[PDB]
Amino acid sequence: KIPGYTYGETENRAPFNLEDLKLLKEAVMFTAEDEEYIQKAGEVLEDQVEEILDTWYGFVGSHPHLLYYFTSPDGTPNEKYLAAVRKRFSRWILDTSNRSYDQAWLDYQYEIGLRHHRTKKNQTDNVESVPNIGYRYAVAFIYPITATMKPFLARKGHTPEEVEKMYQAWFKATTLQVALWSYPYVKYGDF
Amino acid sequence: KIPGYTYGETENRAPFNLEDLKLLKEAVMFTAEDEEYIQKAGEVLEDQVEEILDTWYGFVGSHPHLLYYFTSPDGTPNEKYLAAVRKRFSRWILDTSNRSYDQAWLDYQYEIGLRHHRTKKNQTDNVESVPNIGYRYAVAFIYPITATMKPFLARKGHTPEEVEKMYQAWFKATTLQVALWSYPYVKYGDF
Ligand code: HEM
Ligand code: HEM
Ligand SMILES: [C-]#N
Ligand SMILES: [C-]#N
């Protein structure tokens, strides 16, 4: 088992529903074509995850105000926390590529939002760290997620045109998720 | 000369400052290289704005749940509201590329967020319309903004390298802005 990974068995049903998801997919221009290309992206990325993780957490570690969110009270990174979260992030790369975006998927999107937010941050791994990840950075991180995945999507010999379809699908899917994760951050009724 | 366009003359100072901005630029991987290329993007886009606007508002207009946010209470689109906003969106394309990202800029970023939010929506143009734009869609729209801009960035004969750099700069800058606009939506203390 991956500790903390509770896909399909969360405590709560998401407050947003499949019709909400349909309308949000429309807003990010995500279609069945992107379902196909995000699956292809998974096939490309899967055996590269260790490098992807080093690249991603190397970016987070590169700026003290970002690494901050994994820190103990003494301002140093909590290595237990980083390591446990890293295994769930690795799984999220696969889930984004391989799951159907169905009710179980939506329920886990609510869960991941809750875990970045003060509602559930630091509970999954039972760590002492900062209480909330400022929403400004959740939105910001759509960009570095896509810039991180880009070079890996080209490393299996796909043409620029195919890489572009995978990259755009990943961009749409990442934006879609962060949009959903806003729920616990946003004043009730404003989401 | 643009009705409702009050850049430099907002009633409020922004609740985020230049240090917040520096740290958020770092979160979207924005550097002096992007300053060069966002300015080049403006030079490329400036004389294409009518077609860009037709494309963008064509996208909004093609989805009833998005066009919704410009409708009168009787459910029908308010074309005056659309037209007035269109003029300020046109200017935003130039501002994104030409303004220093400084205090005045931050003040107007807070203003734009307030205008999508119930705080100020429908006041600028003195219209009667939907009270609030749900934040889920503001995040989602990062994607179709970038997808709208992309083809136009190639239309002045720049090299593929330069077009990609302009596109990435636009994506960083759009993400940066939507992150800032979240302020009035986000539970107090969670931004
Ligand atoms: C596009 C935005 C982001 C994506 C795609 C992303 C992805 C993920 C994933 C997949 C997980 C594990 C979820 C699970 O428990 O199964 C996670 C957890 C976490 N992320 Fe992010 N994340 C984003 C934004 C942020 C930001 C802005 C930070 C700031 C450094 C950050 C820091 C963390 C931390 C500290 C956790 C553990 C939260 C907890 O205590 O449960 N993430 N993230
Ligand atoms: C990336 C996200 C978005 C961008 C870049 C964007 C851009 C803009 C700009 C530049 C303006 C005029 C600002 C001014 O007053 O100077 C504006 C206003 C407006 N936008 Fe957006 N927008 C975004 C999201 C949305 C969404 C999700 C909707 C839903 C259709 C929308 C609908 C409108 C409406 C109705 C107004 C007028 C608000 C008011 O009454 O003042 N926008 N937008
Ligand atoms: C989040 N990593
Ligand atoms: C907003 N358009």
Numbering used by the authors:
A (entry chain A), B (entry chain B): 5 to 195
Can you list sentences taken from the study reporting this PDB entry?
Protoglobin (Pgb) is a recently discovered haem-protein with distinct structural and functional features that make it unique within the globin superfamily. The MaPgb* structure can be considered as an expanded version of the 3/3 helical sandwich typical of “classical” globins (i.e. Mb), with an additional N-terminal extension, built by a 20-residue loop, followed by the Z-helix, which precedes the globin-fold conserved A-helix. Residues belonging to the Z-helix contribute to formation of the Pgb homodimer, which is centered on the intermolecular four-helix bundle built by the G- and H-helices of the two subunits. Thus, in Pgb the access of diatomic ligands, such as O2, CO, and NO, to the haem is granted by two orthogonal apolar tunnels that reach the haem distal region from entry sites at the B/G and B/E helix interfaces.
The sites of MaPgb*(III) mutations (Trp(60)B9Ala, Tyr(61)B10Ala, Phe(93)E11Leu, Leu(142)G4Ala, and Ile(149)G11Phe) are located in the surroundings of the haem, or along the two tunnels; the mutations were designed to evaluate the (structural) impact of the selected residues on the stabilization of the haem-Fe(III)-bound ligand and on the reshaping of the haem distal cavity/tunnel system. The other two mutations considered, Leu(142)G4Ala, localized at the proximal site just on top of His(120)F8, and Ile(149)G11Phe, adjacent to Trp(60)B9 in tunnel 1, do not produce any significant deviation in the overall conformation of the distal site and in the cyanide binding mode relative to the MaPgb*(III)-cyanide structure. off for cyanide dissociation from cyanide-bound MaPgb*(III) and Leu(142)G4Ala and from the Ile(149)G11Phe ferric mutants, all characterized by ligand stabilization through two H-bonds (to Trp(60)B9 and Tyr(61)B10), are lower than those reported for ligand dissociation from the Tyr(61)B10Ala and Trp(60)B9Ala MaPgb*(III)-cyanide species, characterized by ligand stabilization through one H-bond. Overall, the single mutations do not affect significantly the tertiary structure of the mutated proteins, which are always closely similar in their backbone to that of MaPgb*(III)-cyanide, displaying rms deviation values which range between 0.17 Å and 0.49 Å, calculated for 190 Cα atom pairs.
